[PDB]
């Protein structure tokens, strides 16, 4: 696993092309996330 940029605790990937995309994020320490909810699902075929 890499390190965060010096003086930072994560990276934010801001979309700069696709105006509808939301952000993505990276952490470099597993301790910085807790898996709160487990969601079981299917994708639905469009009508």
């Amino acid at each position: 696993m890499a390190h965060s940029p010096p003086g930072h605790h994560s990276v934010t990937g801001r979309p700069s092309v696709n105006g509808l995309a939301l952000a993505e994020y990276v952490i470099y320490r597993g301790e910085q996330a807790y898996p709160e909810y487990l969601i079981t699902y299917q994708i639905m075929r469009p009508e």
Binding site: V11, Y25, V26, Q32, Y34, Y37, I39, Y41
Partner: protein, 161 residues
């Protein structure tokens, strides 16, 4: 140490988690190649993940980050899709759960869009799809995502395509 508690569909907590899942679906530039073609999900179950040791590990680190960032953890609720979901809920996140080849280096990746995390349920790029039918757009097989509490602290802003 992990127990899973089923949420009732009548529970406000079930409903707010489902709404975040459904409302953050988008179209993907791959036309559905990795994650499948869909506009919404059929939610089958939502379970609370309870592990006191993993929670204390999280809050210990959160306090360290907060103290380095004017008492601000910058905590978000974000999606994570992975073939190792069932390992993560028992053992926690660690270097085995990192995306070595990601755009922002080898780290653990999370998404605001549930449909982005859905692209990784069967591996990078959807791998070979569901184990049963080898279909990245399988409408039959049950998938799992995590909705995770994530400490960002001071976050480096990368503008990117």
């Amino acid at each position: 140490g992990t127990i899973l508690i089923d949420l009732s569909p009548d529970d406000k907590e079930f409903q707010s988690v489902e709404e975040e899942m459904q409302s953050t679906v988008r179209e993907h530039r791959d036309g559905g190649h990795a994650g499948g073609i869909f506009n919404r999900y059929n939610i089958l179950k939502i379970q609370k993940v309870c592990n006191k040791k993993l929670w204390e590990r999280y809050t210990h680190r959160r306090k360290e980050v907060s103290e380095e960032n004017h008492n601000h953890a910058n905590e978000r609720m974000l999606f994570h899709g992975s073939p190792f979901v069932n390992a993560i809920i028992h053992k926690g996140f660690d270097e085995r759960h990192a995306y070595i080849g990601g755009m922002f280096g080898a780290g653990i990746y999370f998404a605001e869009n549930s449909s982005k995390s859905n692209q990784y349920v069967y591996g990078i790029g959807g791998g070979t799809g569901c184990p049963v039918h080898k279909d990245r757009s399988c409408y039959i097989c049950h998938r799992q995502l995590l909705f995770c509490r994530v400490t960002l602290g001071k976050s480096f802003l990368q503008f990117s395509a």
